[PDB]
Coordinates of C-alpha atoms in Angstrom, one line a residue:
Chain A
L1 CA -15.6 32.3 -24.6
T2 CA -11.9 30.7 -23.8
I3 CA -8.5 31.7 -23.1
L4 CA -5.5 31.5 -25.7
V5 CA -2.2 31.3 -24.1
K6 CA 1.1 30.9 -25.5
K7 CA 2.8 27.3 -26.0
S8 CA 30.4 12.1 -8.5
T9 CA 31.1 11.7 -5.0
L10 CA 30.1 8.1 -5.4
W11 CA 32.4 6.9 -7.9
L12 CA 35.5 8.0 -6.1
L13 CA 34.6 6.0 -2.9
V14 CA 33.8 3.0 -5.0
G15 CA 37.0 3.1 -6.5
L16 CA 39.1 3.7 -3.3
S17 CA 37.1 0.6 -2.3
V18 CA 38.4 -1.5 -5.8
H19 CA 41.7 -0.5 -4.9
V20 CA 41.5 -1.3 -1.2
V21 CA 39.9 -4.8 -2.0
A22 CA 42.5 -5.7 -4.3
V23 CA 45.6 -4.7 -2.4
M24 CA 44.2 -6.8 1.2
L25 CA 42.9 -9.8 -0.8
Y26 CA 46.2 -10.3 -2.8
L27 CA 48.4 -9.3 0.6
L28 CA 46.6 -11.9 2.4
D29 CA 46.9 -14.4 -0.6
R30 CA 51.1 -13.8 -1.1
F31 CA 51.2 -13.9 3.1
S32 CA 49.1 -17.0 3.1
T33 CA 49.6 -9.3 -11.2
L34 CA 48.6 -6.5 -8.6
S35 CA 48.0 -4.2 -11.6
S36 CA 46.2 -7.4 -12.9
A37 CA 44.1 -7.5 -9.3
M38 CA 43.5 -3.9 -9.9
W39 CA 42.0 -4.9 -13.7
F40 CA 40.4 -8.1 -12.6
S41 CA 38.5 -6.1 -9.8
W42 CA 37.9 -3.1 -11.9
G43 CA 36.3 -5.7 -14.8
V44 CA 34.0 -7.5 -12.3
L45 CA 32.8 -4.4 -10.8
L46 CA 31.8 -3.2 -14.5
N47 CA 29.7 -6.2 -14.9
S48 CA 31.9 -8.8 -16.7
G49 CA 33.5 -11.7 -15.3
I50 CA 36.8 -10.4 -16.7
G51 CA 39.4 -12.5 -18.4
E52 CA 39.2 -16.3 -18.3
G53 CA 41.0 -16.9 -14.5
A54 CA 39.2 -17.2 -11.1
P55 CA 41.4 -16.6 -8.2
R56 CA 42.6 -19.8 -7.0
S57 CA 41.9 -19.0 -3.2
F58 CA 38.3 -19.5 -2.9
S59 CA 37.7 -17.0 -0.6
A60 CA 38.4 -14.3 -3.3
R61 CA 35.9 -15.9 -5.2
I62 CA 33.6 -15.8 -2.7
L63 CA 34.2 -12.1 -2.3
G64 CA 33.3 -11.6 -6.0
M65 CA 30.5 -13.0 -5.4
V66 CA 29.4 -10.8 -2.4
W67 CA 30.8 -8.0 -4.5
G68 CA 26.8 -8.4 -5.9
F69 CA 27.5 -4.9 -5.5
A70 CA 27.6 -4.4 -9.3
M71 CA 24.2 -5.6 -9.5
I72 CA 22.9 -3.3 -6.4
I73 CA 24.8 -0.1 -8.0
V74 CA 22.8 -1.4 -11.3
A75 CA 19.6 -0.9 -9.4
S76 CA 20.4 2.2 -7.6
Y77 CA 20.7 4.1 -11.2
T78 CA 18.0 2.5 -12.5
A79 CA 15.8 3.7 -9.6
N80 CA 17.7 6.8 -10.2
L81 CA 16.4 7.4 -13.9
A82 CA 13.1 6.1 -12.3
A83 CA 13.2 8.9 -10.3
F84 CA 15.2 12.0 -11.9
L85 CA 13.9 11.1 -15.3
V86 CA 10.1 10.9 -17.1
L87 CA 8.2 10.2 -13.6
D88 CA 7.1 14.0 -13.6
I89 CA -4.8 27.1 -15.7
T90 CA -8.3 26.9 -16.4
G91 CA -10.2 30.4 -16.1
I92 CA -13.2 29.0 -14.5
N93 CA -11.0 28.5 -11.6
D94 CA -9.0 30.4 -9.1
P95 CA -5.4 29.9 -9.2
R96 CA -4.1 33.1 -11.1
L97 CA -7.2 34.6 -12.2
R98 CA -10.0 35.3 -9.8
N99 CA -7.3 36.6 -7.1
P100 CA -5.2 38.0 -10.0
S101 CA -1.6 39.4 -10.2
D102 CA 0.1 41.8 -12.7
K103 CA 2.3 39.0 -13.8
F104 CA -0.4 37.3 -15.5
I105 CA -1.5 40.1 -18.0
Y106 CA -4.8 40.5 -19.2
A107 CA -6.8 41.9 -22.6
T108 CA -9.5 41.9 -24.5
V109 CA -10.2 43.6 -27.9
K110 CA -11.6 47.4 -27.0
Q111 CA -15.2 48.3 -28.5
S112 CA -16.6 44.9 -28.1
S113 CA -19.6 43.1 -26.3
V114 CA -16.8 41.2 -24.1
Chain B
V1 CA -18.6 42.7 15.5
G2 CA -15.5 42.3 15.3
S3 CA -14.4 38.9 15.7
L4 CA -12.6 38.9 19.0
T5 CA -10.8 35.5 20.6
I6 CA -13.0 34.6 23.3
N7 CA -11.1 34.3 26.7
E8 CA -12.5 34.4 30.6
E9 CA -12.0 38.1 30.9
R10 CA -13.6 39.5 27.4
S11 CA -16.4 37.3 28.7
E12 CA -16.0 39.3 32.3
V13 CA -16.3 42.2 30.5
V14 CA -19.1 42.0 28.0
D15 CA -21.7 39.8 26.8
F16 CA -21.0 36.9 24.7
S17 CA -23.8 35.4 22.9
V18 CA -23.0 34.0 19.6
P19 CA -22.0 30.9 18.0
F20 CA -18.5 31.3 17.5
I21 CA -16.1 30.8 14.4
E22 CA -13.3 28.6 16.2
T23 CA -9.9 28.7 16.2
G24 CA -6.4 28.5 18.4
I25 CA -2.9 30.0 18.9
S26 CA -0.1 28.9 16.6
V27 CA 3.3 30.3 15.5
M28 CA 4.4 31.0 12.4
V29 CA 7.6 29.0 11.3
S30 CA 9.6 28.6 8.2
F31 CA 13.5 0.5 2.2
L32 CA 14.3 -2.1 -0.6
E33 CA 14.8 -4.9 2.3
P34 CA 11.4 -6.3 3.0
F35 CA 11.6 -6.9 -1.0
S36 CA 14.8 -9.0 -1.6
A37 CA 14.6 -11.4 1.4
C38 CA 10.9 -12.7 0.8
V39 CA 12.5 -13.7 -2.8
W40 CA 16.1 -14.5 -1.2
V41 CA 15.1 -17.5 1.0
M42 CA 13.1 -19.1 -1.8
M43 CA 16.0 -18.0 -4.4
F44 CA 18.6 -19.6 -1.7
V45 CA 16.0 -22.9 -1.5
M46 CA 16.2 -22.9 -5.1
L47 CA 19.7 -22.4 -5.2
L48 CA 20.5 -25.6 -2.8
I49 CA 18.3 -27.3 -5.2
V50 CA 19.8 -27.1 -8.3
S51 CA 23.3 -27.5 -7.0
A52 CA 22.0 -30.6 -5.8
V53 CA 20.3 -31.8 -8.5
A54 CA 23.4 -30.7 -11.1
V55 CA 25.9 -32.6 -9.0
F56 CA 23.4 -35.9 -9.4
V57 CA 23.4 -35.3 -13.2
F58 CA 27.1 -35.6 -13.8
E59 CA 27.4 -39.1 -11.4
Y60 CA 30.0 -39.7 -14.0
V61 CA 36.8 -27.6 -10.9
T62 CA 33.4 -29.1 -9.9
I63 CA 32.6 -28.0 -6.0
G64 CA 33.2 -24.4 -6.1
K65 CA 32.7 -23.9 -9.7
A66 CA 29.2 -24.8 -10.0
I67 CA 27.8 -22.3 -7.1
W68 CA 29.5 -19.6 -8.8
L69 CA 28.2 -20.2 -11.7
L70 CA 24.5 -20.3 -10.1
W71 CA 25.5 -16.8 -9.0
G72 CA 26.7 -15.8 -12.3
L73 CA 23.8 -16.8 -13.5
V74 CA 22.1 -13.6 -12.4
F75 CA 25.3 -11.9 -13.0
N76 CA 25.5 -11.8 -16.9
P77 CA 30.3 -27.8 -19.9
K78 CA 30.0 -30.7 -21.4
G79 CA 26.2 -31.9 -20.1
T80 CA 23.7 -30.6 -22.5
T81 CA 21.0 -31.6 -19.9
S82 CA 23.3 -29.2 -17.5
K83 CA 23.0 -26.2 -20.3
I84 CA 19.4 -26.6 -20.5
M85 CA 19.3 -25.8 -16.4
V86 CA 21.3 -23.2 -17.2
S87 CA 19.0 -21.8 -19.6
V88 CA 15.9 -22.4 -17.6
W89 CA 17.2 -21.1 -14.6
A90 CA 18.7 -18.0 -16.3
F91 CA 15.1 -17.2 -17.9
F92 CA 14.2 -17.4 -14.0
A93 CA 17.1 -15.2 -13.3
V94 CA 15.9 -12.4 -15.9
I95 CA 12.4 -12.7 -15.0
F96 CA 13.0 -12.2 -11.5
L97 CA 15.5 -9.3 -12.3
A98 CA 12.8 -7.7 -14.1
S99 CA 10.2 -8.0 -11.7
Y100 CA 12.9 -6.8 -9.0
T101 CA 13.3 -3.7 -11.4
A102 CA 9.5 -3.1 -11.6
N103 CA 9.4 -3.5 -7.7
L104 CA 11.8 -0.9 -7.1
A105 CA 10.3 1.5 -10.0
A106 CA 7.0 1.1 -7.8
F107 CA 8.8 1.9 -5.0
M108 CA 10.1 5.0 -6.8
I109 CA 6.3 6.6 -7.0
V110 CA 7.4 18.7 14.1
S111 CA 4.1 19.2 16.3
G112 CA 6.2 18.5 19.3
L113 CA 8.3 21.5 19.1
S114 CA 6.2 23.8 21.7
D115 CA 8.3 22.2 24.6
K116 CA 11.6 20.8 23.6
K117 CA 12.5 24.0 21.3
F118 CA 10.4 26.9 22.7
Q119 CA 9.4 26.4 26.3
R120 CA 12.5 24.4 26.7
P121 CA 14.5 27.5 28.2
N122 CA 17.7 29.3 27.1
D123 CA 19.1 26.7 24.7
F124 CA 18.7 25.4 21.1
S125 CA 21.4 25.1 18.2
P126 CA 20.5 28.7 17.1
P127 CA 19.7 31.2 19.5
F128 CA 16.3 32.4 20.3
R129 CA 14.4 34.6 17.9
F130 CA 10.5 35.1 18.6
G131 CA 8.0 37.3 17.3
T132 CA 5.4 39.6 19.2
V133 CA 2.5 41.4 18.8
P134 CA 2.3 44.4 21.6
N135 CA -1.4 43.7 21.9
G136 CA -4.0 41.1 21.0
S137 CA -5.0 38.1 23.9
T138 CA -2.1 35.8 22.8
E139 CA 0.8 38.1 23.9
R140 CA -1.3 37.9 27.3
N141 CA -2.0 34.1 27.4
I142 CA 1.6 33.1 26.9
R143 CA 2.3 35.9 29.5
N144 CA 0.1 34.6 32.3
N145 CA 0.8 31.1 31.2
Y146 CA 4.3 30.7 29.8
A147 CA 6.3 33.7 31.3
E148 CA 9.5 32.1 30.9
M149 CA 8.6 31.9 26.6
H150 CA 7.1 35.3 27.3
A151 CA 10.0 36.6 28.5
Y152 CA 12.1 35.3 25.8
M153 CA 9.7 36.1 23.2
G154 CA 9.2 39.8 24.3
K155 CA 12.9 40.2 23.3
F156 CA 11.9 40.6 19.6
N157 CA 8.8 43.0 18.9
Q158 CA 7.1 43.5 15.7
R159 CA 5.2 46.7 14.5
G160 CA 2.3 44.4 13.1
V161 CA 2.3 41.4 11.1
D162 CA 3.7 42.2 7.5
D163 CA 6.9 43.4 9.5
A164 CA 7.0 39.8 10.5
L165 CA 6.0 38.2 7.7
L166 CA 9.3 39.9 5.6
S167 CA 11.1 38.7 8.8
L168 CA 10.4 35.3 8.6
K169 CA 10.3 35.5 4.5
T170 CA 13.7 36.9 4.6
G171 CA 14.8 34.4 7.6
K172 CA 15.6 37.1 9.8
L173 CA 13.1 35.5 12.8
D174 CA 12.3 32.1 13.3
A175 CA 9.1 32.3 15.0
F176 CA 6.2 34.6 15.5
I177 CA 3.3 33.8 17.7
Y178 CA 0.1 34.7 16.3
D179 CA -3.9 33.6 16.3
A180 CA -3.6 30.7 14.0
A181 CA -6.9 31.5 12.0
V182 CA -5.6 34.2 10.3
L183 CA -2.3 32.5 9.7
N184 CA -4.8 29.7 8.0
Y185 CA -6.1 32.6 6.2
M186 CA -2.5 33.3 5.2
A187 CA -2.8 29.8 3.6
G188 CA -4.7 30.7 1.5
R189 CA -3.1 33.9 0.8
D190 CA 0.6 33.2 0.2
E191 CA 1.7 31.8 -3.6
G192 CA 5.4 31.1 -2.7
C193 CA 4.6 27.9 -0.9
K194 CA 7.1 28.9 2.1
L195 CA 3.8 29.0 3.8
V196 CA 2.6 27.8 7.2
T197 CA 3.5 26.0 10.3
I198 CA 2.9 22.0 11.4
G199 CA -0.4 21.6 9.1
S200 CA -1.4 18.7 11.5
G201 CA -4.8 20.1 12.0
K202 CA -3.8 20.9 16.0
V203 CA -4.1 24.4 17.1
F204 CA -2.6 25.0 20.8
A205 CA -5.6 26.7 21.8
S206 CA -9.4 26.3 21.5
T207 CA -11.3 30.0 21.3
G208 CA -14.0 31.3 18.7
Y209 CA -14.8 34.4 17.0
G210 CA -17.7 36.6 17.2
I211 CA -19.4 39.5 18.5
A212 CA -19.8 41.2 21.8
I213 CA -23.1 42.8 22.9
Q214 CA -24.1 44.7 26.4
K215 CA -24.8 42.5 29.1
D216 CA -28.1 42.3 30.6
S217 CA -30.3 44.2 27.9
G218 CA -33.3 43.2 25.8
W219 CA -31.6 41.7 23.3
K220 CA -30.8 40.0 20.1
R221 CA -32.2 36.4 20.6
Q222 CA -33.5 36.6 17.2
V223 CA -30.1 37.2 15.8
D224 CA -28.8 34.3 17.5
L225 CA -31.5 31.9 16.0
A226 CA -30.9 33.8 12.6
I227 CA -26.9 33.1 12.5
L228 CA -27.4 29.5 13.8
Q229 CA -29.7 29.2 10.7
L230 CA -27.1 30.5 8.6
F231 CA -24.7 28.3 9.9
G232 CA -27.2 25.6 9.2
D233 CA -27.6 26.7 5.8
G234 CA -23.9 26.2 4.7
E235 CA -23.8 30.1 4.1
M236 CA -20.4 29.7 6.4
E237 CA -19.6 27.5 3.6
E238 CA -20.6 30.0 0.8
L239 CA -18.8 32.5 2.7
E240 CA -15.4 30.6 2.9
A241 CA -16.0 29.6 -1.0
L242 CA -15.6 33.7 -1.5
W243 CA -12.8 34.3 0.5
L244 CA -11.1 31.2 1.9
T245 CA -9.7 29.9 -1.2
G246 CA -6.1 28.7 -1.5
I247 CA -2.9 28.4 -3.8
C248 CA -0.5 25.7 -2.2
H249 CA -3.2 23.5 -0.9
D250 CA 19.9 10.2 -0.7
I251 CA 22.8 9.4 1.8
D252 CA 21.2 7.0 4.3
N253 CA 21.0 3.8 2.2
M254 CA 24.3 4.1 0.5
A255 CA 25.5 4.2 4.5
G256 CA 23.4 1.3 5.3
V257 CA 24.6 -0.6 2.0
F258 CA 28.2 0.2 3.2
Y259 CA 27.8 -0.9 6.8
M260 CA 26.4 -4.4 5.7
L261 CA 29.8 -4.0 3.7
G262 CA 31.9 -3.7 6.2
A263 CA 30.1 -6.6 8.5
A264 CA 30.4 -9.1 5.4
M265 CA 34.2 -7.7 5.3
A266 CA 35.1 -8.3 8.8
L267 CA 33.1 -11.9 8.2
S268 CA 35.9 -12.4 5.6
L269 CA 38.8 -11.3 7.8
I270 CA 37.8 -13.7 10.3
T271 CA 37.2 -16.4 8.1
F272 CA 40.5 -15.9 6.5
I273 CA 42.0 -15.8 10.1
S274 CA 40.2 -19.3 10.7
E275 CA 41.6 -20.8 7.3
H276 CA 45.4 -19.2 8.2
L277 CA 44.8 -21.2 11.4
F278 CA 43.7 -24.2 9.7
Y279 CA 46.9 -25.8 8.7
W280 CA 47.6 -26.0 12.3
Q281 CA 45.3 -28.9 12.7
Chain C
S1 CA -7.9 4.7 14.3
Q2 CA -9.0 1.8 16.1
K3 CA -10.7 -1.1 14.6
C4 CA -8.7 -1.1 10.8
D5 CA -11.5 -1.3 8.7
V6 CA -11.2 4.3 6.6
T7 CA -13.0 7.9 6.4
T8 CA -13.5 9.7 3.4
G9 CA -13.9 13.3 2.0
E10 CA -13.5 16.3 4.5
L11 CA -15.6 17.8 6.6
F12 CA -18.7 18.6 5.1
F13 CA -20.3 20.4 7.9
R14 CA -18.8 22.4 10.3
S15 CA -20.2 21.1 13.7
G16 CA -19.5 21.6 17.3
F17 CA -19.9 19.9 20.6
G18 CA -22.8 21.2 23.3
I19 CA -24.2 20.5 26.7
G20 CA -28.1 20.5 27.4
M21 CA -30.0 21.3 30.4
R22 CA -32.7 23.5 32.0
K23 CA -33.3 26.9 31.8
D24 CA -32.3 29.6 34.5
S25 CA -29.1 28.2 35.3
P26 CA -26.8 31.0 35.9
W27 CA -23.8 29.3 37.4
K28 CA -23.4 28.3 33.2
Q29 CA -21.3 31.8 33.4
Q30 CA -18.9 30.1 35.8
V31 CA -19.2 26.8 34.0
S32 CA -18.2 28.5 30.3
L33 CA -15.1 30.3 32.7
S34 CA -14.3 26.5 33.5
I35 CA -14.4 25.8 30.4
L36 CA -12.0 28.3 29.2
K37 CA -9.9 27.6 31.8
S38 CA -9.5 24.0 30.8
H39 CA -8.6 25.2 27.4
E40 CA -6.4 27.9 29.3
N41 CA -4.4 25.0 31.9
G42 CA -4.0 22.7 28.9
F43 CA -6.5 20.1 30.7
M44 CA -8.2 19.7 27.5
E45 CA -4.5 18.9 26.5
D46 CA -4.2 16.4 29.1
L47 CA -7.5 14.8 27.8
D48 CA -6.3 15.2 24.5
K49 CA -3.4 13.1 25.1
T50 CA -5.1 10.6 27.5
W51 CA -7.7 9.4 24.4
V52 CA -6.4 10.4 21.2
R53 CA -3.1 9.2 21.8
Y54 CA -4.8 5.7 21.1
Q55 CA -4.9 6.1 17.4
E56 CA -3.6 2.8 15.8
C57 CA -4.4 2.8 12.2
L58 CA 7.5 -24.6 -13.6
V59 CA 9.7 -25.9 -11.6
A60 CA 8.6 -29.6 -10.8
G61 CA 7.5 -29.5 -14.2
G62 CA 11.2 -29.2 -15.5
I63 CA 12.4 -31.5 -12.9
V64 CA 10.5 -34.3 -14.3
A65 CA 11.0 -33.2 -17.5
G66 CA 14.7 -33.2 -16.9
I67 CA 14.3 -36.7 -15.2
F68 CA 12.5 -37.9 -18.6
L69 CA 15.6 -36.4 -20.6
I70 CA 18.5 -38.1 -18.9
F71 CA 16.9 -41.4 -19.7
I72 CA 16.4 -40.3 -23.0
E73 CA 20.1 -39.0 -23.5
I74 CA 21.0 -42.5 -21.9
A75 CA 19.2 -44.5 -24.2
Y76 CA 20.4 -42.0 -27.1
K77 CA 24.1 -42.4 -26.1
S78 CA 23.9 -46.4 -25.2
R79 CA 22.7 -46.7 -28.8
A80 CA 25.0 -43.9 -30.5
Chain D
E1 CA -40.5 14.1 15.2
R2 CA -43.9 15.6 14.3
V3 CA -46.7 13.6 16.5
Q4 CA -49.5 12.2 14.2
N5 CA -52.1 13.2 16.4
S6 CA -53.3 17.2 16.0
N7 CA -50.5 19.8 15.4
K8 CA -47.5 18.5 17.8
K9 CA -43.7 18.6 16.9
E10 CA -42.3 16.5 20.0
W11 CA -38.8 16.2 20.8
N12 CA -37.8 12.7 21.9
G13 CA -35.0 10.8 24.1
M14 CA -32.7 12.7 26.3
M15 CA -34.3 15.6 24.8
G16 CA -37.6 14.6 25.6
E17 CA -37.0 14.0 28.8
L18 CA -34.9 17.4 29.6
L19 CA -37.9 18.7 27.8
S20 CA -40.3 17.0 30.3
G21 CA -38.2 18.1 33.0
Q22 CA -36.6 14.8 33.6
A23 CA -33.0 16.0 33.3
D24 CA -31.1 18.9 35.4
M25 CA -28.2 18.0 32.9
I26 CA -27.8 16.1 29.4
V27 CA -24.3 15.5 28.4
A28 CA -23.9 14.3 25.3
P29 CA -22.3 14.8 21.6
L30 CA -24.7 17.7 21.0
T31 CA -24.7 19.7 17.3
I32 CA -27.2 21.9 18.9
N33 CA -29.9 23.1 16.4
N34 CA -32.1 26.4 16.5
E35 CA -35.0 24.0 17.8
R36 CA -32.8 22.7 20.5
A37 CA -31.8 26.0 21.6
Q38 CA -35.0 27.7 21.5
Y39 CA -36.3 25.7 24.2
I40 CA -33.0 25.2 26.5
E41 CA -30.2 26.9 28.2
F42 CA -26.9 25.5 27.5
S43 CA -23.1 26.3 28.1
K44 CA -20.7 26.8 25.4
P45 CA -19.2 24.0 23.3
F46 CA -15.9 23.5 23.4
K47 CA -15.1 20.7 20.8
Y48 CA -15.5 21.6 17.1
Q49 CA -15.6 18.9 14.4
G50 CA -17.0 17.9 10.8
Chain E
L1 CA 33.3 -7.7 -29.9
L2 CA 31.8 -4.2 -30.4
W3 CA 28.4 -5.7 -31.6
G4 CA 28.7 -7.8 -28.3
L5 CA 29.5 -4.9 -26.0
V6 CA 25.8 -4.2 -25.8
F7 CA 25.2 -7.8 -26.3
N8 CA 26.0 -8.9 -22.7
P9 CA 42.9 -9.8 -25.5
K10 CA 46.1 -9.0 -24.5
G11 CA 46.2 -4.9 -25.1
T12 CA 45.5 -3.7 -21.7
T13 CA 44.8 -0.1 -23.1
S14 CA 42.2 -2.4 -25.7
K15 CA 40.6 -3.4 -22.4
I16 CA 40.2 0.2 -21.0
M17 CA 38.4 1.1 -24.5
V18 CA 36.3 -2.1 -23.8
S19 CA 35.6 -0.8 -20.2
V20 CA 34.6 3.0 -21.2
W21 CA 32.2 1.6 -24.1
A22 CA 30.9 -1.1 -22.1
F23 CA 29.9 1.8 -19.5
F24 CA 28.7 3.9 -22.9
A25 CA 26.7 0.7 -23.8
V26 CA 25.3 0.1 -20.5
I27 CA 24.4 4.1 -20.0
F28 CA 22.8 4.0 -23.8
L29 CA 21.0 0.8 -22.8
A30 CA 19.4 2.4 -19.4
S31 CA 18.3 6.0 -21.3
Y32 CA 16.3 3.7 -24.0
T33 CA 14.6 1.8 -21.4
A34 CA 14.1 5.1 -19.6
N35 CA 12.9 6.6 -23.7
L36 CA 10.2 3.5 -24.1
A37 CA 8.9 3.5 -20.5
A38 CA 8.4 7.2 -21.2
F39 CA 6.7 5.9 -24.4
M40 CA 4.9 3.1 -22.1
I41 CA 2.9 6.2 -20.6

């Protein structure tokens, strides 16, 4: 006997971070190509040493080193795809059968031995 | 023969000679940085090693381009041996990134409320919404023991058990104080898995279940021996195998990254202030 | 919980915690009443906190290959 | 344990002592069985384990 | 350069296209790594 059954807010904040980083760094550089500062910081956010030119101020190169921010956000969305993606009743047992309900429907063939 | 929660006064009134089924009283209510640094310290040691060695191989755009290129090894000349060093430590970079992605994928796989919320008089963040039954020993015990909670609880009286079940189920009520073992059978009764309080195994009483007989008769010693035998025969385990069956049996890491971002930001700001000072020397 | 070396499975047989004494000790009524009072006045919970609160429980080879290869290329470029 | 001598099943230890009247009170972790309870008096247990 | 988009000028809009389809490339590589990890079970 067997039973047959029928078969978002992160992007805006990091964009504000890109914008604030670019304007603050090149204002500090001009005190002691801002469209290009936007495009440079945007391209190195996108895991790409963009263009050909490093900033001649070494401090902005150090800040490009510490902003490993593209790598850690790569790590976070790979953890998300490890979590959001793939990661995740026998008739002998209880769950819906020994204490059943009408949402689980039962039938046999009438005038038979079962 | 109806199973009763044994207090002093039921033992005062009648005779108890039964090994009881124990129970108590409850209330129905409705990280990747040990892994970086252990790799990161050997990584920075290796960084100092390879920077010193790559300076040594070109005893022949220099002092700052080198360590930038070492950081760009992970962040994907004319000395051919320098390109060999780039090749080997880039293989090191990709194997370390693969092992760390495997490590983060490996990571990818309320009991003390009785005083601070309920015994604590007159305040919680919502107002008090408790549940009674207008009989039973639980009401009497909280009456003679926690009379503040008794006064706060008796504001909302319930006409049985299922009225409180549907009020907690609709969220109209927040608390319903009852004998806990009936709620443990209710753990094997509800299917929606909005189920049962704390589940720590700790009930906030220690009483039992059994039979009341007449005091000072010629009585029923053999029934006590027989029920202890049926206990020892595992027939209680048979009985729960009959009836007691069951059904249901971020933000902080992002802010913790952003706080270290702000700390490195302040470090770079005071570094720039010092470098702005350093033409005055 | 104390010694960190673990229990397995559930409670395989329900068991209690009894006392032993001689027969005809009629003060056992008030003894069981004081048992229920310790259960009532939370003295069992005082013992519960006071005792159950104690729960407690390649690089070097590449380096020498490089120190070979530097003299290899020294010889190759001094000859060519 | 059953005594190997003729037809005796005798308690030992604390229970053999209280059986022999060598105790007014025995306090111990006691899962009191039928054979314990058929000889003695005892107040109610208070801790429930498994 | 289109094949080097997956395999990690002066027209700024061309670099905009590079950035958008490089985002496309890395999200497709991430989904395919998730697909082979689904096959790995």
